[PDB]
Amino acid sequence: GTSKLKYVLQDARFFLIKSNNHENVSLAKAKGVWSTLPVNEKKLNLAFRSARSVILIFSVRESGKFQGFARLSSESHHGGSPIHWVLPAGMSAKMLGGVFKIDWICRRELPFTKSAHLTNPWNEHKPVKIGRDGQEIELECGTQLCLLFPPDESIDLYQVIHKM
Ligand SMILES: CN(Cc1cc(=O)[nH]c(=O)[nH]1)Cc1c(F)cccc1Cl
């Protein structure tokens, strides 16, 4: 092992990222991209400039689990190849912010039952599973949460470390 993982997470910032469906997480896992509404786009762009690593921890709404976590490799940007996100009824591609590039650190899931001992100081010490989309997770809680996930032996953090 966990040493390279701990190195990537050192002095990182962490954000709880919701998805409306599994399809969008699948797209993010396949293409290494994420997009948010403008309010969270501004927060994440500020964080990306502020920290050695910004970690997105993903949870599909109503799933009772986290689906993995990834590190921002870029600020948001517009104009790339369009991503066929499954948007909710009534939401248009024009309402999205730019696209963030991300490097997956773990594509394995973690059930909320396994993180019941972790509370987030930045959300009133409620269990870390609880938060609005974009809720920041304090360093220690976020580090422990990431370390609970099953190791993803398919990923090599060597190239991630070189981007820091
Ligand atoms: C790429 N994106 C997935 C996504 C979901 C979510 O709940 N939060 C989030 O930051 N992104 C499109 C989108 C939706 F499909 C639904 C709400 C907001 C947005 Cl931006």
Swiss-Prot record:
Effect ascribed to mutating F58D: Does not affect ability to influence alternative splice site selection
Q: Where in the cell is it found?
A: Nucleus; Nucleus speckle
Give, from the UniProt record, the effect of changing S19A. Answer: Does not affect ability to influence alternative splice site selection
Please state every residue range assigned to the domain named YTH.
12-149
Q: What is the effect of changing S59A?
A: Does not affect ability to influence alternative splice site selection
Residues the record lists as Phosphoserine modifications: S81, S92
Q: What is this protein called?
A: YTH domain-containing protein 1
Give the stretch of the parent protein shown, with its full length.
Answer: 345 to 507 of 727
